[PDB]
Amino acid sequence: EKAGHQTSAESWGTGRAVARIPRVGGGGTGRSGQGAFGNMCRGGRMFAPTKTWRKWNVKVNHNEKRYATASAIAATAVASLVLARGHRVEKIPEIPLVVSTDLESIQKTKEAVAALKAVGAHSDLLKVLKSKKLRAGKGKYRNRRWTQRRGPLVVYAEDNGIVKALRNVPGVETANVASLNLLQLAPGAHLGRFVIWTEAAFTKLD
Amino acid sequence: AISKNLPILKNHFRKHWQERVKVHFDQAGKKVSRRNARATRAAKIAPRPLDLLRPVVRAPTVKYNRKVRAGRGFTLAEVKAAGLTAAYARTIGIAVDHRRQNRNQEIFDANVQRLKEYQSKIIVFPRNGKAPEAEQVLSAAATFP
Amino acid sequence: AGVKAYELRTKSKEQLASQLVDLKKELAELKVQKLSRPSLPKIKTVRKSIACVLTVINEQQREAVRQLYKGKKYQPKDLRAKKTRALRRALTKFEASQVTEKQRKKQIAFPQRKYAIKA
Amino acid sequence: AKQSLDVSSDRRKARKAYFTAPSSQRRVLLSAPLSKELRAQYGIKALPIRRDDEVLVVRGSKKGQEGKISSVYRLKFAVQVDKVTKEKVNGASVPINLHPSKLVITKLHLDKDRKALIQRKGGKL
RNA sequence: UUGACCUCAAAUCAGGUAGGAGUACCCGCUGAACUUAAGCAUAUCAAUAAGCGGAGGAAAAGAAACCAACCGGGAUUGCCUUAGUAACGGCGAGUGAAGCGGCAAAAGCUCAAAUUUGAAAUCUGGUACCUUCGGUGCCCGAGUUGUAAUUUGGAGAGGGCAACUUUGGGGCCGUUCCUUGUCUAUGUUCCUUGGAACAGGACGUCAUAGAGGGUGAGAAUCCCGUGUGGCGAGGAGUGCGGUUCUUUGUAAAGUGCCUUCGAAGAGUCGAGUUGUUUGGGAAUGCAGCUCUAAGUGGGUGGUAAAUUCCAUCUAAAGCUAAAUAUUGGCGAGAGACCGAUAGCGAACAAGUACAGUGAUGGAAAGAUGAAAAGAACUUUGAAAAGAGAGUGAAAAAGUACGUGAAAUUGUUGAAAGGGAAGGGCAUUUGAUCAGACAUGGUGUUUUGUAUU
RNA sequence: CGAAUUUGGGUAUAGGGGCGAAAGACUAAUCGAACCAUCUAGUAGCUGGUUCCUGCCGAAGUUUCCCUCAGGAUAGCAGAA
RNA sequence: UGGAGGUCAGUGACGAAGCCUAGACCGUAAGGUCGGGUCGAACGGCCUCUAGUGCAGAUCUUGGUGGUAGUAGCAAAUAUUCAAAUGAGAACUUUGAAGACUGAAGUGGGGAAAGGUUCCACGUCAACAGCAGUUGGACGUGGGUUAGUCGAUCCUAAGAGAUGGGGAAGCUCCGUUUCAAAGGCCUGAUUUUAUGCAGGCCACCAUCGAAAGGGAAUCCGGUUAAGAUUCCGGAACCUGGA
RNA sequence: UAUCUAGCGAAACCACAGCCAAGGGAACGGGCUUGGCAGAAUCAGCGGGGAAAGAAGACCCUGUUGAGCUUGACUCUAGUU
RNA sequence: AAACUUUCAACAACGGAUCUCUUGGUUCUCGCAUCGAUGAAGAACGCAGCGAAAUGCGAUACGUAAUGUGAAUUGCAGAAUUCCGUGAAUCAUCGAAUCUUUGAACGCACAUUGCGCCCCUUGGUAUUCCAGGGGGCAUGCCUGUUUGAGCGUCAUUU
């Protein structure tokens, strides 16, 4: 809030063959007699300084959110939209894909990857793994160094180690049927997420 | 300064509001801290229910005359009718209000019944007993809606 | 090498004073050598040894006066706690815990009960 | 991924800690791994390097080069090993810094502190 | 003559305390103007900036001389709302709360005014010990112009009877956590480029660990770490079941009927003026001056004044965590932030160099290379340096070093030139360049007819 | 050019104040109100500037009121839906 | 154009970004794509989100660079010349020989304020000495300032300024002897004591304030790269004490 | 001194630049139109022109911009009575 | 067709733009409460084998003591038999010390490195003079001790 204003600059006025911009004065520095207090000046403040009370979070209707979530779920059901989103579902026997209490109560990441291979999301695992790439901006030193695709979303009803196993499994996200975030039901506002359901998850969706 | 057909607005922004702006970025942090403090207090008073028993009290004005809510504490007359003392009730967690008065038989009876139900619903552990842990509940307000 | 604090503590006060005076003499001789020579760290070694002897003497003297003042109030201000000015002005634990007879009787008669709600 | 709230995933913070770590933290950083035979003998994968160990450079322009460390330049974040030098064209030998992560240890200079360290890590000697 | 008491002194008397720093927040005092009103004086800015005094981790406030007018609520504080509303305002510009309601947090209380009067039962201090944040004994002193116990209005005290119920201590075994320390997974296997593999290609392994960083390029598996778990030390300390141990015995507290009482804060309340302030308007609060109370009295009940009722509290004395604050200090985690003229003035020996008598003002300034391996040696030159070498992946990285734009310069060279140059339309000349004839065609004299 | 002289040092007078044999003079190259920092990014109906392309449409300097006459509101002209 | 969510399992050390290029293609254009050089580590297309998002000007800000232009100019203070030496190199350095000037209210010999090592020696010319430099008040390294008598220190002047005390909400103001209970040295009793004592008098009634006022006392000769009324030799004096 | 050399070496100013006559034009052109003309590179002067440079005219007007000063302006105020 | 402007399949200059990077800032959130007469914050001098600055420290001076780790520091030297250890370290932790002149700053003053007084000890054939070492002497307030003053006022006669 005080950037560009930590000076006692005062305009020289007219009659001195210089622009009327305020000038830090004094002497013996090189900063003396130098323009200040302006977006056009070096060292001055910017135009319309950025403020913290800008709007950051935007309110949304609950019914609108639920409509979007239901549309995302139905788009997940639609098989063409998953291919359009590019989720390597050309090998899945049919969509939606339902697994059972074995995957619900799975415990180790090795058997998690094995179950993913059995069902057909191992291609998505490889997609994410080979898609991990460096960013193309300043996020690399702003703590967003690498970018990668999104893998399957395994949705469950009860947590018995599935979350931890598929948590270390790259790309794959896990969700509870109670929450079912739109943020991964349609990443990047693109419909057709690859979602792996369980039987309990299907009944809880009901 | 004034222009086409528009409502006349009264925006009180002729002071240094930019210095006096408070933005609640800490909503989530405050909620987390409040839940953490509630959990810590519950652990500190592990058998106790984290809440005092509040009486049933009628809202004052004619706008809210229809509604009933929670008061501050039970009257001394209500405590006497329940059959104990104000200090004892304060120790066992009944909120006691000295300045409230009982001029309504319905409210008197409702609060006396609340006190009786609370007494039948609690178990005061003896000072030098076996300490029979009793699986605390976390809300007397929820236990006696 | 440098003398070590444990044998400095083992040795007596006369030995400590003699060692200190010999260390000062060696410092003077070594400093003349430094004036006559380009570079040498034995002067730092000797200064460290002098510091060790001086701190051993200081700690033994402070321990002696502490044992002299042991058991009695009004200790010298260099021996009492240096915690903080505010902490020292603050009430002691006994003073803070002190309560009146009325409040003591009230607390004894009506403490906080350990009640619970199950059924 | 990380799960604790006392560990930071900040690149700037991590680099600051690395570059401003003290001498002991630097020793822990310049910890180095043992060879296959050494690991089979003891049961330890990596150890903080020492001055008088024996190291086999297995990565870099001097891959597969045996020697013994001459110094552990914690300030330079490397180790200097004898027989691994550069010949300044005036005819001088200047040590070449090699990273302990790139080298491998083929012999342990064992004192009782190192033996206790192996025991704590879970070695068998 | 000798002892006191009261008041006031003096001691390098014995022991203590205050100052100052610090402003991010907090409690007050003092206090503007620029500005807006399209002028300007009330107003606004603003009960703000500047100045002054005073604390803490929070402060302040706080358990009603409250809000209300209801079937009443019930300390304080904060949020949503009330509400840009009631109201104030050259009724213009503008300003502008509070009750109720939902929620967060909830904690309640204690002094004065009482004869202990069958025993000042109270306390500081000095000595002597001890189990030393203190205890015990003794002796001075303070104190009867009042120190204990007992009571704080919600009550309570003194008496006459009533079936009762509750214990006391200083060290541990584990207890939010503080200082923390340590241990626990898996490739550096093989080919290609490269100076370096951390890149690409095969085979793998671990994973409650594929967060991050470093290593000669983009590394889960090379290192530190990360995930889950064990263990070891030094603490403020009640989160209690058992603790090494004599019996506190008339002893404190609560309670049920009655009887008599029931003390409750004064130059204060209140009133009149003056000034300031407030939304408070025949005056909201504060303060100066004048007058000056009462005891079922006194205050309030948002229109000034009689008179008659009602409702609600109990001032002129005091303490108290939490929810709240947070551009300061300490520690930590992050971001759709900035990226060396940006971001703090300061990424760097930055409040530095420097200027001013002084208050004060206040810069510029990052990058060789993976590694100095920082150019040995010969020669010209007085020397600086040059040429040749040498190191390096690169010297088109050589202190004046990552890349090295433009302005502005010297030189390969090309064209033009009678007091400007540049430009448009259109050709010519010179220079230079893309497009296009193996394109999906003949069936057999040439062939390099499963290739046509 | 022996004095109402000249001058060093130490002192006192500080900003609406000082000092002035009086010029609005001097008060650190600043004086018809110094300098420093802050309020302050003071206000400005008044100057200056206001950064990519193409397509379509496309004006007004006139009415009324205003301490209004270098400005606004209003109606008119124009665009879009 | 800078960032963000998706996707291209997109491009890349066999060369990304960037920059240069009267080379090419496309779009009416904003511009995009490619060819060739330099370069060495990241970057892009598509669907969306977002903004500190587009420069020719503002006597715009900061930095850099021109024509003018090898130009104006380097002309006050009378003035330089010959030889030698040293040096790569001499109008400028040193030595000698001439010629001159300041002409004792100096261009001499010291000091005050101020400066702070500029003093001196030895090396030494990258920058500075608006020409040059072998020289320097420049650069590098070192040396140098010696007091009982000279000053400060002591006194008080103009004045400043605590205390008692009184104002001010307060930072602080007044006041300096005023409406204050304002106080230290001598033969000393001569031996366990003790400026407690058989004793004595007063009256400035803090302090600061002058390196030119007042004031206790040192001179000569010699000595160094530089210090001397300070060192040395000689000859003295003052204060305090015994 | 200027001038020419050896060494050293700035600044003002600069939309682009630099030959005229008339015309018209914002009513006094270096550029536009018509005509006169027009030949590299330059040196010393020179002061007609560049409506030459120096400064957001200080004269005048406007602003609902000030300030110094005055008073029998409006509204107040220290002091005094 | 010489010398004097434009453009390079072109170099070399001047200059530091762009690109890439970042132990730095800026905002957000969370946790905690800790300055000083037991002398703070801030100054001024000095301390390293070679230091001018910066860091740290105070004549015990780039540090002493204690604890932990375990074999360094490194620009060049220096003691590597300390390296199976009561032990390197420009290490970490940090509880004992030291802490020059100052500074609220305290004996009085302060443009003085000025001027006092008290106590003890030592030396100068010394209680007084000088010197050396050590310990002290501020003000405003509170409680207490001692010594006092006041026909303020009680007990009221040699």
Distance CA(A10)–CA(A25), nearest Å, equals 8
Instruction: List CB contacts (< 8 A) between A167 and chain D.
Output: 1
Burial D74-107, CB ≥16 within 10 A → b, else e: beeebbbbeebeeeeeeeeeebeebebebbbbbb
Does the CB of B3 fall within 7 Å of any strand F atom?
A: yes
Between CA D82 and CA D69 the distance in angstroms is: 6
Q: What are the angstrom distances between the C-alpha of B42 and each of A133, B31, B96, B137, D55?
A: 48, 16, 22, 10, 58
The two structure tokens encoding residue D23: 């001498």
D112 CB below 7 A from strand I atoms? yes
User: Are the C-beta atoms of residues A156 and A164 closer than 8 Å to each other?
Assistant: no
Residues 6+ apart with CB under 8 A from D23: D74
Chain C residues near residue B123 by CB distance under 8 angstroms: 115-118
Residue C106 tokens, joined: 């009230």
Other beta carbons within 10 Å of A201: 24
- The chain D residue lying nearest A169, using CA atoms, is D1
- Distance in angstroms (rounded) separating the CA atoms of residues A201 and C18: 88
Question: Which nucleotides in chain G lie closer than 7 A to a protein CB?
Answer: 2-12, 42-44, 47-48, 52, 58-63
Q: What is the torsion angle, in degrees rounded to the nearest 10, for the CA atoms of residue A61, residue A67, residue A69 and residue A72?
A: -140
Burial of A146 by CB count in 10 Å (0-12 exposed, 13-18 middle, 19+ buried)? exposed
D35 closest CA partner among D20, D16, D61, D56: D56
Report d(CA A82, CA A89) in Å as an integer: 7
| CB within 8 Å: B25 and A52 | yes
Residues belonging to chain D: 125
Q: How many CB atoms lie within 10 A of CB A129?
A: 13
Q: Any bridge partners for residue A156, and if so which? A: A176
* C-alpha torsion sign, points A125, A131, A135, A141: positive
Q: What was the experiment behind these coordinates?
A: cryo-EM
Closest CB to C115: pick one of B48, B87, B143.
B48
Cα–Cα distance for residue pair D66/D104, rounded to 1 Å: 9
Task: Find the nucleotide nearest C77 (Cα to C1′).
Answer: I38
Q: Rounded distance, CA D32 to CA D55, Å?
A: 10
A141: Cα separation from own chain's centroid:
17
D67 φ, ψ (degrees, to nearest 5): 180, -175
List the strands of the sheet with A173-176, edge to edge. A97-99, A195-198, A153-156, A173-176
Give the separation between CA A25 and CA A99, rounded to whole angstroms. 76
Q: Are B94 and B118 in contact (CB under 8 A)?
A: yes
Question: Which amino acid, residue A143?
Answer: N
SS3 assignment, position D90:
coil
Nearest Cα of chain B lies from the Cα of C106 at a distance, in angstroms, of 9
If residue D13 lies in a helix (H) or strand (E), which one and from where to where? helix D11-19
> CA-to-CA distance for C103 and C101, rounded, in angstroms?
6
How many angstroms separate the CA atoms of A54 and B45, rounded?
A: 43
DSSP character at residue D34: B
What is the Cα–Cα distance from D119 to D123, expressed in whole angstroms? 5
User: D81 near D55, Cβ under 8 Å?
Assistant: yes
What is the C-alpha separation between D41 and D118, in angstroms, rounded? 11
| ∠ CA B75-B92-B105, rounded to 5° | 25
Identity of the amino acid at C53: V
Q: How many CA atoms lie within 13 A of D38 on its CB side?
A: 20
Maximum Cα–Cα distance across chain B: 82
With beta carbons less than 8 A apart as the criterion, state whether B54 and B95 touch: yes
> What Rg value do the Cα atoms of chain D yield, rounded?
16
- Map tokens 């322009």 to a residue: D61
Give the dihedral sign, CA A54/A56/A62/A66: positive
- Which residues have CB under 8 Å from D118's CB, separation 6+? D42, D44, D47, D110, D125
* Record: contact C118-B127, CB cut-off 8 A: no
Beta bridge partners of A34: A24
Amino acid at residue number D120: R
Identity (one letter) of the amino acid at B117? E
Nearest to B122 among C109, C111, C117 (CB): C117
Q: Report yes or no: B102 and B75 within 8 Å, Cβ to Cβ.
A: yes
- Listed as ranges, the nucleotides of chain H within 7 A of a protein C-beta are 13, 54-57
Between the CA of residue A134 and those of A53, A149, B110, what are the distances in Å? 33, 12, 69
CA of A12 to C1' of G191 (A): 92
| Cα Rg of chain B, angstroms | 23
Do residues A106 and A162 make contact, with C-beta atoms less than 8 angstroms apart? yes
Q: Give distance CA A20 / C1' E408 (Å).
A: 30
The answer to whether D97 and D80 are in contact (CB under 8 A) is yes
> For residues B105 and B49, is the Cβ–Cβ distance under 8 A?
no
Residue in B34, B57, B139, B132 with CA at minimum distance from that of residue B93: B139
Cis peptide before A49 (omega within 30 of 0): no
Q: Which residues pair with A10 in a beta bridge?
A: A23
Residue C118 vs residues A16, B44, B115, C90: alpha-carbon distances, Å: 88, 18, 16, 44
Residue B111 near residue B74, CB atoms below 8 Å: yes
Q: Hey, is C34 helix, strand or coil?
A: helix
Q: Give start and end residues of each alpha helix (H) in C1-119.
A: 5-10, 13-36, 42-68, 85-89, 93-97, 101-109
Q: What is the resolution of this structure in A?
A: 2.7
Hunting for tokens 């942090």 — which residue is that? B29
Strands (DSSP E) contained in chain D are 31-33, 46-48, 54-57, 65-73, 78-88, 92-98, 103-107
**What contacts 24+ positions apart, CB below 8 Å, involve B126-132?**
B127/C111, B131/C114
Give yes or no for a contact between C45 and C26, defined as CB atoms under 8 angstroms apart.
no
Angstrom CA distances, C80 to A200, C66, C69, C74, D68, stand at: 70, 10, 11, 9, 55
In this structure, is the CB of residue D24 within 7 Å of any atom belonging to strand I? yes
Read out DSSP for A78-144?
-HHHHHHHT---SSSSSSSEEE-HHHHT---HHHHHHHHHHHT-HHHHHHHHHH-EE-SSGGGTTT-
- Torsion over CA: A68, A69, A72, A74 (sign): negative
Cα torsion angle, D111, D115, D118, D123, sign? positive
Rounded to whole angstroms, the distance from the CA of residue B13 to the C1' of nucleotide F41 is: 17
**Nearest Cα to Cα of residue D105 among D52, D41, D43, D32:** D32
**DSSP readout, A31-45?**
STTEE-SSTTSTTSP
Q: Which two tokens stand for residue D13?
A: 């913070």
Question: At residue D83, what are phi and psi to the nearest 5 degrees?
Answer: 70, -5
In the DSSP assignment, the letter for residue D67 is E
Residue D48 bridge partners (DSSP): D31
A189 CB inside 7 Å of strand G: yes
CA–CA distance, C97 with C93 (Å, rounded to integer): 6
| Gapped junctions in chain B, after residues (C–N > 2.5 Å) | none
Query: Straight-line distance from CA C69 to C1' E16, in Å?
Result: 20
Question: Hey, of A5, A52, A53, which one would you mutate to test binding to chain B, going by the most B CBs within 10 A of its CB?
Answer: A53
Distance of alpha carbon B4 from the chain centroid: 52
In angstroms, rounded to a whole number, what is the distance separating the alpha carbons of residues B49 and C1?
68
Chains B/D: 3 or more C-beta pairs closer than 8 A?
A: no
Query: Residues B76, C98: contact at Cβ < 8 Å?
Result: no
Residues 10-39 of chain A in contact with strand H via CB under 7 angstroms: 14-18, 20
| Nearest nucleotide relative to A132: CA against C1' | G9
Q: Which of residues 5-44 of B touch A (CB under 8 A)?
A: 18, 21, 23, 25
To probe the interface with C, which of B85, B92, B120, B144 has the most C CB atoms within 10 Å?
B92
Length of chain B: 145
Distance from C-alpha of C18 to C-alpha of C3, rounded to nearest angstrom: 14
- C-alpha to C-alpha distance for A78 and A96, rounded to whole angstroms: 8
The reply to whether A55 Cβ lies less than 7 angstroms from strand G is no
Half-sphere exposure of B17 (CA within 13 A, CB side): 7
Neighbouring subunits of B (3+ Cβ pairs under 8 A): A, C
- Show the tokens assigned to D14: 């991590």
Helices (H), B1-144: 27-44, 76-82, 86-91, 105-121, 140-143
Crossing angle (nearest 10°) for helices C42-68 and C13-36? 160
Phi, psi (deg, nearest 5) at residue C88: -70, -40
Do the Cβ atoms of A161 and A105 come closer than 8 Å?
A: yes
Q: List protein-proximal bases of chain E (any atom < 7 A from a CB).
A: 15-18, 37, 44-48, 56-57, 64, 67-75, 84-85, 94-97, 99-111, 126, 130, 132-135, 148-152, 154-155, 166-168, 176, 182-189, 195-198, 206-216, 218-219, 222-228, 237, 239-242, 252-255, 312-314, 323-327, 332-335, 337-339, 341-346, 351, 353-356, 360-364, 370-377, 390-391
- Indicate yes or no: strand E within 7 A of the C-beta of B39: no
**D99 vs D79: CA distance, rounded Å:** 6
